[PDB]
Amino acid sequence: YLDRKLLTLEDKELGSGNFGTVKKGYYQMVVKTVAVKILKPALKDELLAEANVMQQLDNPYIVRMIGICEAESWMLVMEMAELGPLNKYLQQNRHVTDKNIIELVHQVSMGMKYLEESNFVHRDLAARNVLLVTQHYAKISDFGLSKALRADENYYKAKWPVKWYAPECINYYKFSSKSDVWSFGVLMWEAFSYGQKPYRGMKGSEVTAMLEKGERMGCPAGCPREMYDLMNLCWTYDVENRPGFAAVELRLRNYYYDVVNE
Numbered sequence: 001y002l003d004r005k006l007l008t009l010e011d012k013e014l015g016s017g018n019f020g021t022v023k024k025g026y027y028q029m030v031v032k033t034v035a036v037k038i039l040k041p042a043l044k045d046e047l048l049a050e051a052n053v054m055q056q057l058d059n060p061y062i063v064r065m066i067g068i069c070e071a072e073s074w075m076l077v078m079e080m081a082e083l084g085p086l087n088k089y090l091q092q093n094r095h096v097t098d099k100n101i102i103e104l105v106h107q108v109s110m111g112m113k114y115l116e117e118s119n120f121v122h123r124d125l126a127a128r129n130v131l132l133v134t135q136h137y138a139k140i141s142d143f144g145l146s147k148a149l150r151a152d153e154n155y156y157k158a159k160w161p162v163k164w165y166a167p168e169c170i171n172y173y174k175f176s177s178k179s180d181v182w183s184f185g186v187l188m189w190e191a192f193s194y195g196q197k198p199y200r201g202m203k204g205s206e207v208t209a210m211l212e213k214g215e216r217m218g219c220p221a222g223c224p225r226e227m228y229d230l231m232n233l234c235w236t237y238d239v240e241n242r243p244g245f246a247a248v249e250l251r252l253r254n255y256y257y258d259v260v261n262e
């Protein structure tokens with residue numbers, strides 16, 4: 001699809017994953033600054049599946065794909081989020097206000113509400129997969145594990161990011177928008193913890209044991225009671241009683257407007 005002659009890549013890598021590297025580039029559309037996933041048979045199919053998901057999505061809070069290019073390696077060219085991953089940003093900017101964190105996490109809930117309405121499951125929702133366009137504009141990224149739900153099912157049956165996964169994912173291998181809501185609760189905890197890793201010092205098996213005991217991570221320092229209450233609701237054990245994204249986004253929206261009033 002894209003013309004390799006129209007793409008100029010920077011040598012430095014922004015990041016990496018088993019897929020390969022993420023590099024900054026420029027594409028001749030005006031010129032568009034881009035982030036490019038560069039592959040490093042199954043990997044090619046995985047990148048094309050990621051591209052196929054992104055092609056179907058159109059929302060202000062989800063990273064846009066520009067196109068694909070088959071050159072020195074398969075490349076997935078996407079819009080650039082200049083400020084990078086949310087967890088890293090907050091670790092480096094410890095004075096971002098609680099109001100600003102709520103604004104950003106609410107934007108992610110708006111993107112996830114759209115994803116749920118579209119019947120896609122993200123399956124890797126975590127602060128490392130929320131990118132900042134500006135200090136006030138967040139977008140969801142990294143659709144490599146995402147799936148388009150079948151017309152007749154509300155779940156996808158499957159190394160996993162265990163600390164972000166709901167009990168039904170671990171126990172029954174079933175991934176739904178409600179499974180993404182559980183991950184969104186962990187993402188909220190990460191955001192209010194300024195990008196600290198969740199379940200510090202614990203093995204995945206210890207986390208599963210902790211959750212089975214009805215125990216949950218505590219309230220981050222300075223996190224508003226209302227936001228902690230929402231994280232706990234996202235962490236409802238029984239998938240059937242857990243809220244969907246419409247309910248989560250509404251709670252965040254109303255709380256953000258309350259904060260804005262001051």
Ligand SMILES: N[C@H]1CCCC[C@H]1Nc1cc2nc[nH]c(=O)c2c(Nc2cccc3cc[nH]c23)n1
Nearest residue numbers: 014015016035063078079080081082084128141
């Ligand atoms: N989850 C991230 C981090 C883990 C590995 C994978 C990596 N993935 C992505 C996917 C992306 N998709 C679309 N646009 C992006 O900009 C982008 C992206 N930018 C990005 C990453 C890291 C640092 C910086 C600094 C500026 N931009 C950065 N990182």
